């Protein structure tokens, strides 16, 4: 019992869906009724790798064996649905919570916050923020981080720096997040003076080491073979709190690097993240489908992934090269057509490879390119500013 739960929790934290699945089958093969905690662990393990259907199947099987859902199971469900931007599943689970009578803690509120942020619903995000402040409870660092990310995404510099100066007044040792999307938002409007004034304080960082390393390497001082090793050890050290934090860290870093003119550095960061285990759904290569998944990424992370995906396509044939802009219930609707992810990907492909990547006549959240259009096709110039 203890060994099964420990292994399953470790796999879920580390995003090892396959190992958790194998443990589940082995322990079910011995006529052992699974507990709620182990089922929650395997569900959250499946959600790390964006395997929503497997997590939903496990959640459905949870009630079959008599294991009732707990608060941790719901927290994992909201976090997994929020990472992918599936806000419809988010409000469905919220309705399930409201009809189950369980009180909503900060986890539900902030999971909804980033679920609407990744889905592009900025107005609903701020509405849910004001509702969170209306009722009760104190937002943690995660809530203000999510609102800073949503403000940076929706071209709001002024509220961004207001929240920045408000949050740093609490002596909280601001994390990699805040700096990363602050560089991103300042690079949105070519605020080179603000970027430099942030970097001047960022470079020293007498307190922590991670900030110093990343601030040195973003400027290009750590690009050498020996000078990238410090970045590699700091990345390895950071790969211990879990893939849930790793995906956010890589998203923020990629957005900052892409929006600061460091396209080659962003490409190399994405390349080193792929072998780590973060973004396991990023690339699929087979005779049938050559796909890139971006529904869990930010705008900056999408552009870096698309840039390196286009370059690999020109090197080489699959029956179809597709872009998974939106994944979830929104696919069978016109709502995903207007989504910021879909329109951003479409505009990027349109201005880079001309009118070759068309939409899908059956799916509302995919960008399509037949093999015939692949036949007629270094495409994206990756340079450091």
């Amino acid at each position: 019992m203890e060994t099964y739960e420990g292994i399953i929790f470790a796999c879920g934290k580390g995003g090892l869906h396959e190992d958790a699945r194998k443990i589940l089958q082995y322990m079910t093969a011995k006529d052992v009724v699974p507990s709620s905690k182990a089922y929650t662990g395997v569900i959250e393990a499946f959600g790390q790798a964006a395997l929503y259907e497997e997590a939903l199947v496990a959640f459905n099987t949870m009630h079959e064996v008599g294991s009732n859902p707990s608060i941790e199971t719901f927290h994992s469900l909201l976090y997994s649905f929020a990472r992918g931007g599936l806000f419809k599943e988010s409000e469905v689970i919220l309705s399930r919570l409201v009809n189950s009578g369980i009180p909503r803690n900060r986890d539900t509120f902030n999971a909804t916050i980033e679920a609407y942020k990744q889905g592009g619903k900025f107005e609903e995000a701020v509405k849910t923020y004001v509702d969170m402040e209306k009722s009760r409870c104190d937002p943690d660092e995660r809530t203000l981080e999510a609102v800073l990310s949503v403000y940076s995404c929706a071209r709001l510099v002024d509220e961004c720096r207001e929240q920045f100066e408000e949050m740093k007044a609490s002596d909280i040792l601001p994390s990699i997040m805040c700096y990363c999307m602050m560089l991103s938002v300042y690079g949105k409007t070519e605020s080179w003076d603000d970027v430099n004034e942030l970097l001047e304080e960022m470079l020293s960082n007498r307190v922590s080491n991670i900030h110093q390393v990343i601030g040195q390497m973003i400027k290009g001082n750590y690009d050498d073979d020996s000078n990238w090793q410090i970045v590699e050890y700091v990345l390895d050290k950071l790969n211990s709190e879990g893939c849930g934090l790793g995906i956010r860290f890589y998203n923020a870093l990629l957005d900052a690097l892409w929006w600061l003119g460091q396209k080659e550095r962003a490409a190399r960061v994405l390349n080193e993240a792929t072998k780590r285990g973060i973004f396991p759904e990023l690339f699929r290569k087979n005779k049938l489908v050559w796909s890139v998944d971006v529904h869990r990424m930010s705008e900056g992370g999408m552009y870096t992934a698309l840039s390196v995906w286009l370059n690999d396509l020109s090197d080489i044939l699959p029956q179809l090269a597709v872009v998974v802009s939106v994944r979830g219930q929104l696919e069978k609707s016109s709502a995903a057509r207007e989504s910021p992810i879909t329109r951003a990907a479409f505009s990027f492909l349109q201005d880079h490879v001309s009118s070759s990547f068309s939409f899908t006549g059956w799916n509302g959240g995919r960008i399509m390119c037949q093999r015939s259009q692949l036949k007629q096709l270094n495409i994206v110039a990756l340079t450091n500013s």
Partner: peptide, 17 residues
């Protein structure tokens, strides 16, 4: 006379939607 001849799948598995 009358005595002659001795006289659950598909549940908890619906579409999430």
């Amino acid at each position: 006379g009358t005595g002659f001849n001795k006289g659950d799948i598909l549940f908890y598995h619906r579409e999430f939607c």
